């Protein structure tokens, strides 16, 4: 069996959910979403914020707890074939993480650029940020933490220690979320402008760099793949 159709679901769930989110913000961007003190803003975007934060907390808790509870206790007696299967599953997790990172750090981040360049910033909880800071960022954080936990709990290569590149790849992009404090502070106190290249945004930049640890993470996963079932063929 090896690589199964979990990869198709991993791509499709993010694609479909974010296409629906884009449709939602296209429908309610203006007209319940321009005036932050208007009553329909509360029912169309503040309610969205509340629901998404609650669901994110619940989903993160359930997913991480399940992955940690079902952790493999007897990793020593794991056959190379099952190890290859688990390596492919971890690669599917990494694919989901990469897709979520794309959606969060490219699509909705620049989408918030356009929104904040075309309208007057009205609050810290604008429709664009509701979708970017508090939906897409938590979603990719949850996916990255889940991938890290899966590697640590199923792959003997990633067990017996915390991989530094994986930890950086998972935690650095997470630090973009608390960095929103600098964004809000730097937009209300510093820089009465909408310059996207303002130094108030360098918090996203610096911690966006830590996603480059995917290179060390991926060579680690390549070595984990090539442990027992490295071949032969490869170098043969």
């Amino acid at each position: 069996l090896l690589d199964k159709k979990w990869l198709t679901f991993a791509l499709a769930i993010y694609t479909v959910f974010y296409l629906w989110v884009r449709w939602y913000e296209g429908v309610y961007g203006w007209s319940a979403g321009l005036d932050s003190f208007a009553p329909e803003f509360e029912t169309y975007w503040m309610n969205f914020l509340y629901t998404e934060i609650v669901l994110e907390i619940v989903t993160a808790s359930i997913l991480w707890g399940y992955l940690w509870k079902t952790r493999d206790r007897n990793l020593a007696a794991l056959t190379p074939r099952e190890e290859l299967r688990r390596n492919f599953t971890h690669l599917v997790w990494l694919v989901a993480y990469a897709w979520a990172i794309y959606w969060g750090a490219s699509y909705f981040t620049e989408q918030d650029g356009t929104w904040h360049q075309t309208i007057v910033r009205d609050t810290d909880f604008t429709p664009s940020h509701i979708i970017e800071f508090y939906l897409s960022y938590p979603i990719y954080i949850i996916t990255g933490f889940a991938a890290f936990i899966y590697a640590k709990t199923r792959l003997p290569f990633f067990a017996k220690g915390i991989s530094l590149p994986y930890l950086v790849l998972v935690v650095g992009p997470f630090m973009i979320l608390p960095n929103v404090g600098l964004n809000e502070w730097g937009h209300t106190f510093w820089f009465m402008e909408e310059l996207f290249v303002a130094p108030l945004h360098y918090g996203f930049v610096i911690f966006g760099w830590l996603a480059l640890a995917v290179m060390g993470t991926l060579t680690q996963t390549f070595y984990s793949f090539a442990q027992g079932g490295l071949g032969q063929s490869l170098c043969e």
Partner: protein, 382 residues
Amino acid sequence: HGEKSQAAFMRMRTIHWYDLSWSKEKVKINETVEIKGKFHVFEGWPETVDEPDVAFLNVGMPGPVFIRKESYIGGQLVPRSVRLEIGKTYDFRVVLKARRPGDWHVHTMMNVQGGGPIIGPGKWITVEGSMSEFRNPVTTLTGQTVDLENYNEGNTYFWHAFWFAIGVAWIGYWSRRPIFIPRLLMVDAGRADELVSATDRKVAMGFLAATILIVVMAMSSANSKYPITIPLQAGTMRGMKPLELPAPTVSVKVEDATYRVPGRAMRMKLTITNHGNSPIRLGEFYTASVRFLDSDVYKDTTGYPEDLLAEDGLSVSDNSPLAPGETRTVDVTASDAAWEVYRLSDIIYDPDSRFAGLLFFFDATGNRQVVQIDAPLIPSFM
């Protein structure tokens, strides 16, 4: 739409918009709507806002639902940032062409370099038609007429697709062979020197030479066509002509101004001295885009936005005509739901509880006087 969020005192003492007018309330696609009026730069400009040395006359709107055809300060076009002087009054005019159907809240706003957006009163303007009918023709000094909606779009798409295709071809050429694990194992286990061999180096030399040559040829071709180009035209424009207003014949001294917390009313005691030679009467109090009117003295006919207009929201304790030379002290109450809807009552949250506004005094004949008032605004709780 981005207002009702800014600090109440900051909205009160930056820029006072008055004599606002809108040519139309409902337009077709490609139809023009003109917004006129005056704005006065308040003398007590807050220190947290940089002085309006670099200011831009902008339009508050949800993206380009209109295009700004023209904008004027004084009587001259202002496509760039302009310098304003504190205490001066300027007249402005913005011409908008409808582009996107719908109901849009159009604000006239002034962006200040180091202070941010100063949003004036917003008016609902209806656009009907189809966006597909919109045209934005311009005629160049080279004698060609182009539509700004789609001009250069094909060229942009072509060049971006071409360069993307070149990069994809490079990556795919290297991606025909196995990519990650065998190459990693070859590099690690012994010297590699086998995964990059001719004609790979020849392909790379061809790619590099073709890239440089194509860039040079494309630049030369884009030079032969469009032989006449100019750089982007930028730079703050000085010498904005301010309005030459006559000195007001009415002097007003504010003795205490209070507002109830909570409440929808603001109260102030004014000592009004009438100079000149006509009996005056207080007709309006404008504080922050909100016009409190004494209906027995003045009525709005310019179609001011209803949610910003308090037709009878201004009550004067003694609004009888004030004979010339006479000085009297009256209690003025400005009350309307707008005071809470636009969060003017949230000045209690502000670190500077001072208000500013404009008082409009009218005589029997109908001619009006504009006087500016500013004072501390003291909340009252008991």
